[PDB]
Design a protein around this ligand. Structure first.
Ligand SMILES: [Mg+2]
Ligand SMILES: [Mg+2]
Ligand SMILES: [Zn+2]
Ligand SMILES: [Zn+2]
Lengths: 589, 589, 197
DNA sequence: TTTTTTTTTTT
């Protein structure tokens, strides 16, 4: 009843933020600057400013939402006249609706109301076009008339053509005119409930959501999102007789949330401590005590090196880590920790999940038989980390293709008339059990993990975990039971703060090699080759790949402290960690 | 509104090229001389001549293209009256449009405007025919009348039949008359975005394009192309009731660019250098240190020999290279460089390495349940270079399947009621590791390679790469670190001009053997046979295939310098590189 | 099921608040009205034959005196010995095996830690000579457990154990069907002749 | 995709 348009306008311009800065005006100006056409607002702010306005939004969103958008559009064009002729319709979206419904609990009483759903995206269709105002021509030798059939109404989701020509009042044949037809971007996605909320002995439920206008391509598949909108009954084919008076339901998305400058200031401040490197090492897997060398390697892997892209060649910048632990050594604890702390990670096994084990595969279409490509674990992890538990029982097909993916970081297909090349620039962290149950120290590494020696040369660092029944058993037994009761350490960095720290470093730090670091690395590599040459039965191969590992590892240390250059200290740490790796495999360095 | 066909005609004649030669006048002459029926206009020459003409072409493309084409047709008619009743309608093509949009960024606002898209062609359908003006006959005993159904309007993409006979104003049934129906050539192709612009973790997207009239068969799958035209919605099955007002997007191609006299001048200037051969060799994989003899061999395989086609036989002209080396010897890095510089190359490491994936596969056509052949790696590489990696890891039964393709350059299949032959004229470059992962000096050459002599005789050159630590490690380490520091070698022919040089040489230079070269080659072959007979323990058979390898190599050296005949120096170079290959396998001379 | 015959099936319809009142594999008692099923009325041409379906009005799955009886049993100091003696009374000996089988029926307490999860279920493997009554006890366990699934190594497949994809031919749609392991969630899965799988 | 029996190519 009461015109909230004035109330809405003053609320946007007079919203007391964290410091009465009127942040809504700031984002409105930002919207005009880049022509974003979409303004999001928080339900809490509306309720605090005027609870009566908030109730109207959450109860009569069908009626008052277009009214509010018109008021906002008038304000924007009044503020800036150049916004016209570019955007004819602005969008206002609400977030933080208190009406949260579990996906399995949806019933008929929730149809037509504004609700929010939390779940996981599984499928996303390519962007398409939907008609909301069509133009038709009456093909009747006396008419030759054009009109817009859905008069004074948006074209419904069911494509219907006129039966009587409105201009001539006659039936006949009508032809669509694409050139005078209004279109809107249209995308379809599927949301699946999280496994935590699935009841015992039941399969997870699914829901179809529709993304339109700027909401298209707002979330990659496999992301946890929060979706707000209206539910409605799907009509796949209304002309299909055969009873079936039952229908599915779908969601018209109005706002989607996935999963700051202040963070950057605190991240740079956190890097001011000269002992930041050791603090990061301590913060890695705080649950597990000891294993400092293994912890140090994992920190370097997350940061990684700087890849080099040249005119004729590309040089890998990722770091690969192999762990061979005895059963019961709890090798899966920090692996789960790595997945959580990594900004982007993929968890899988040796056999993979789909037909494409790790690299890729070519699959005939089920309906038409056409050949297409399915991405493997390595491809899906591009730009991030690929954690592969149980590396020793990969598919036989992948045992050869993994050579190229782990070194050239590409997957090449020349099968069934399809030629393609897929990027696989992903750091690989893998764990495998010894082939003889328990690791044997005297035996080499190749005959202990059941992998070709060529693969071993592709791993920057290899570590062996042995369940030694020493004095630590009592402490380990106490430690295991303490984890059962619950305990934590002190003076660490939480995963949430650490995750953004790693992400910031990987996006803005590209260390460069200095002359002093260059000389130190050169001498060690020459020393490395001499030692391996003397022993005619070296358990490991010392190839030029090892020299690349020294460069990559040293860069990660500089990146760990957000250093612009690589100095002697970074190089010295890189040499020392490689020295321990050679001792672990049994090489007298 | 003012007209511009006078300006358009004026521009065609009054435009001045780089040397004021009026190329468009010359281009018109070529169009008349060869009855080309299509003209190409560079956009950079339109706004320079008249900026006003540029925008109206871009904006009002639909209502200005027929006007300009009609004016040009009259200009051709006066230039050559006989052009009439040979080509009734002419087309003009505009290239270099400033509006370039990434495939993933196409939205609703882009429909109906002239845009440009860069991508990769993946598949092309066979040429078909489309009706744009139909003729019908009213089957009603009174009528017996014939007419063209779509009056003063081109036939729409949806085939629509009249409901009322225009000649008699009555309903009934109508019969199409194919003899009086006007047709236009029609072809459908699919374009794919380049891997560079694909976001990480996502599969590349595709778009459907339509080529009509002379644009058909202007490109082949696997080509980097730049396409220009207008987008539209796809009404594939409008008769399919059941709602679904959602439509796809396809592209109406107006002009296409694949992949210049100035290039010819640059190429000819390079050939004038007496040491052009050395420069080309030095330009092969500059980032790799050493391996000069291997770099020389790779250059020869890029150019190849001269195939001989006779009335009774065919002789292979391609050169095959085999590389065996220890892990981490830059085998894969050098092979990846070949695919960048080769005009056409195919890569296959581990997937598709079976017999079916390498030559051809018999797959059941699920559309009709029958069988048909699918091209393999070698067939897809016909006319180019096939690169095979990790050949030693292939199964022996799978490896023998390429014996026919490597020599007879054909693939023959007799399986499941299918008997067919396919052309596989491609050069094969293969890399692999020794039998025991690393080369062992104690064992002989035969068991180190671990390949049957039947396949070894088909390789023109074989090289063994040994990673022996010594005093060269310091030089190698310095070179690698210099590469990582951004330092690059100078006086190197870059990539794209090297690719143009190879493409020009292959299709324009055909060296011939002289009497001087005949005597040198004959003498060496006799000497080679005698030496092989001396030692029966050699792992390499000296067959007549080795004699033809000398001829092929000598021709490639002449082709490398754009020479029309093989002289004494080219034969000496061919003999010298043969000596190194023989020494590399323990066969002294 | 009579001798030499296959089990029959009936279709039931749950509406309003009766939805999601049971899970697959449960033994239920259902009350309602029977009616003939019409699905394709437009499909003219013969077939005046219809199937019957049940319109559910109330459903029961599988209480005070029983709780009292249970408490009285637990009061005996030797309740543990009585329970073990009640496992497969027709089998002689095998006291140690019977004791372990009793533990698996009850199980432990699952624990959720900061990062990992500790299962409360107990896994038992039995290796014995032929004729050692191995299959007899497993049949008893599958019958006495409140929720159990009995499978055989030869009569099971990977799809049948975890989940099977069923293509809805009516609409060309894919959906999952619960396997043996999923149906046994919260219960006991019995696998006979695991070595022959 | 799925279980099944069959001939077939190819995993
Ligand atoms: Mg390699
Ligand atoms: Mg038994
Ligand atoms: Zn009309
Ligand atoms: Zn008529």
């Amino acid at each position: 009843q009461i015109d909230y348009r004035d109330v809405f306008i003053e609320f946007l311009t007079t919203f007391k933020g964290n410091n009465n800065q009127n942040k809504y005006i700031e984002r409105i100006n930002e919207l005009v600057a880049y022509r974003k056409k979409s303004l999001i607002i928080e339900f809490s702010d509306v309720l605090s400013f005027n609870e009566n306005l908030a109730y109207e939004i959450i109860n009569n969103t069908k009626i008052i939402l277009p009214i509010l958008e018109g008021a906002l559009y008038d304000h924007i064009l009044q503020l800036d006249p150049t916004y016209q002729r570019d955007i004819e319709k602005v969008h206002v979206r609400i977030v933080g609706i208190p009406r949260v419904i579990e996906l399995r609990k949806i019933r008929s009483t929730d149809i037509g109301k504004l609700i929010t759903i939390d779940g996981i995206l599984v499928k996303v269709t390519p962007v398409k076009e939907r008609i909301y105002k069509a133009t038709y021509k009456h093909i009747h030798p006396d008419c030759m008339q054009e009109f817009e059939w859905p008069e004074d109404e948006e074209m419904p989701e069911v494509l219907e053509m006129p039966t009587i020509c409105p201009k001539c009042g006659k039936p006949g044949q009508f032809r669509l005119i694409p050139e005078k037809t209004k279109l809107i971007d249209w995308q379809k996605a599927v949301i699946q409930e999280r496994p935590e909320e699935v009841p015992s002995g039941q399969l997870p439920r699914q829901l179809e959501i529709i993304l339109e206008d700027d909401l298209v391509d707002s979330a990659r598949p496999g992301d946890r999102v929060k979706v707000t909108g209206i539910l409605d009954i799907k009509q796949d084919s209304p002309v299909k007789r055969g009873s079936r008076a039952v229908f599915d339901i779908y969601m018209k998305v109005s706002s989607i949330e996935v999963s700051s400058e202040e963070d950057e200031k605190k991240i740079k401040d956190l890097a001011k401590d000269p002992w930041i490197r050791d603090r990061i090492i301590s913060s890695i897997a705080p649950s597990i005590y000891g294993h400092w060398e293994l912890k140090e390697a994992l920190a370097l892997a997350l940061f990684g090196g700087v890849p080099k892209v040249l005119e004729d060649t590309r040089i890998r910048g990722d770091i690969h880590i192999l762990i061979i632990g005895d059963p019961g050594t709890a090798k899966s604890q920090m692996l789960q920790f790595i997945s959580r702390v990594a900004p982007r990670a993929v968890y899988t096994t040796g056999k993979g999940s789909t037909a494409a084990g790790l690299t890729a595969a070519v699959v005939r279409e089920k309906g038409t038989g056409e050949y297409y490509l399915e991405a493997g674990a390595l491809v899906l992890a591009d730009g991030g980390i690929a954690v592969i538990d149980e590396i020793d029982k990969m598919r036989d097909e992948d045992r050869v293709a993994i050579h190229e993916a782990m070194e050239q970081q590409t997957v090449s297909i020349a099968k069934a008339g399809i030629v393609a090349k897929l990027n696989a620039r992903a750091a690989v962290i893998a764990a495998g059990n010894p082939k003889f149950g328990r690791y044997i120290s005297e035996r080499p590494v190749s005959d202990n993990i059941n992998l070709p020696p060529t693969i071993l040369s592709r791993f920057d660092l290899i570590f062996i975990l042995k369940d030694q029944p020493g004095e630590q058993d009592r402490e380990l037994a106490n430690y295991i039971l303490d984890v059962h009761s619950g305990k934590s350490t002190k003076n660490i960095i939480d995963i949430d703060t650490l995750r953004k720290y790693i992400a910031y470093a990987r996006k803005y730090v590209t260390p460069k090699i200095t002359s002093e670091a260059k000389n130190l690395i050169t001498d060690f590599f020459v020393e490395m080759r001499k030692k391996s040459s003397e022993t005619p039965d070296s358990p490991i191969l010392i190839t030029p790949r090892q020299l690349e590992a020294l460069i990559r590892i040293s860069e990660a240390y500089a990146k760990m402290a957000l250093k612009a250059e690589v100095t002697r200290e970074d190089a010295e740490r890189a040499i020392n960690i490689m020295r321990l790796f050679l001792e672990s495999v049994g090489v007298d360095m």
